[PDB]
Amino acid sequence: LEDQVSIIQQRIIPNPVSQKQKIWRDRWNDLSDVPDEKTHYENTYVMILRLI
């Protein structure tokens, strides 16, 4: 699902009119410490290990 990752990221993108109306609440500020590996699959794998 590596390409679907970028598709969905493009799908969730701020709207300038909402930003100017001061109603846009970003979603990145809810995630906890996200790992920094090379591949999204590796990041999701580290998350699976954290759950385990």
């Binding site: 799908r11 969730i12 709207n15 300038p16 009119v17 909402s18 109306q21 846009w24 609440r25």
Partner: protein
């Protein structure tokens, strides 16, 4: 400007009941998104002329329409018996301005048909209409007057064959019953059969008399998606347009087949519900796009605005512009309706079987000696 857009600035102010699904407020939402997308210049805006009792008695009975003219939420208690005879009072509630709303919708539809006849337009849009559950002598399914049937009768004065395509999640029971015994109108309806509202719509209901093989019913199971709907919708409509070549199409763009609907059980997205409109527009036939179901107002507004833009030809932006209903649209503020998971149930074998049956029925109209 070959798209004639009908909208009466009052339609949004009629209220069904306390927590009812049908809300004429969606038409006002659509119109505001349009006027702020600036489609108001590329369209042609006509405030409709109200219908009359003589105009609605064409398809409905005189006693029924007289009751609809005389009823009132106060005198309902005295009019109780005729109510339970005419089905008005339980799920088609009697509210303020019932006759006025019915007149607005039916006038929109008849005006669309008259525009297509006079030739001033080739596409005629009316969202206030599309009530396809009304019958000859009783209301049903939040519907009171069959503006689709009135429009078809106005088209048949000049056109020899008329197609009616329903993509609402329910069966077009009223329109089918109206045109069940005629070959000048073919009614193709895609719907969810089983334990669902209308009950009618078996694959075997194919007409009687001269209208044998002129009702087409495509039953579908729970949770159809874009690809499956495409695979059942494009072949059937192409075969219909081949064997029964119509001169005018009436498309009920009902959006209760979307994803996340209070009463629907489908999984279409904005793209899967609009490829239908695109396929039908691609034949260069005069067409009336009428509204219909749709009980989640945010999805309804955005999908209908996109379809208006697609019929006009303009590709609207992806960000919703500033309108008076912005907060209604979620934490993203985009012109889109994504699908959910809701595991499908339509197997390829099922879809292929029903399609082959429909194709054989349509072919029998020209094989099969008389």
């Amino acid at each position: 400007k070959k798209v004639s857009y009908f909208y009466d600035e009052d339609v949004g102010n009629y209220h069904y009941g306390p927590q009812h699904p049908m809300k004429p407020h969606r038409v006002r939402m659509v119109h505001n998104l349009v006027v702020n997308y600036n489609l108001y210049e590329k369209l042609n805006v006509i405030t409709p002329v109200r219908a009359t009792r003589n105009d609605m008695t064409r398809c409905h009975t005189d006693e029924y329409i007289e009751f609809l003219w005389r009823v009132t939420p106060d005198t309902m208690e005295k009019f109780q018996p005729h109510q339970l005879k005419f089905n008005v009072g339980d799920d088609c509630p009697v509210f303020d301005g019932l006759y006025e709303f019915c007149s607005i919708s039916a006038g929109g539809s008849i005006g669309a048909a008259q525009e297509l006849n006079s030739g001033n337009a080739e596409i005629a849009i009316n969202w206030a209409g599309g009530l396809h559950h009304a019958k000859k002598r009783e209301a049903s399914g939040f519907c009171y007057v069959n503006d689709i049937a009135l429009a078809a009768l106005e088209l048949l004065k000049y056109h020899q064959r008329v197609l009616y395509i329903d993509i609402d999640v329910h069966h077009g029971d009223g329109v089918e019953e109206f045109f069940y015994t005629t070959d000048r109108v073919m009614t193709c309806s895609f719907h969810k059969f089983g334990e669902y509202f209308p009950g009618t719509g078996h694959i075997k209901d194919t007409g009687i008399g001269t209208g044998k093989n002129y009702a087409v019913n495509v039953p579908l199971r729970d949770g159809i998606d874009d690809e499956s709907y495409e695979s059942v919708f494009k072949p059937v409509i192409s075969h219909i347009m081949q064997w029964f070549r119509p001169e005018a199409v009436i498309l009920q763009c009902g959006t209760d087949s979307l994803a996340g609907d209070r009463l629907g059980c489908f999984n279409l997205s904005m793209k899967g519900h609009s490829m239908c409109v695109d396929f039908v527009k691609s034949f260069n036939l005069p067409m009336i796009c009428v509204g219909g179901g749709g009980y989640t107002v945010r999805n309804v507004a955005r999908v209908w605005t996109y379809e208006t833009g697609l019929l006009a030809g303009e590709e609207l932006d992806e960000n919703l512009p500033y309108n008076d209903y912005l907060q209604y649209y979620g934490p993203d503020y985009k012109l889109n309706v994504l699908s959910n998971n809701m595991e499908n149930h339509n197997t390829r074998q099922y879809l292929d079987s029903i399609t082959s049956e429909i194709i054989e029925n349509l072919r029998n109209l020209s094989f099969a000696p008389s």
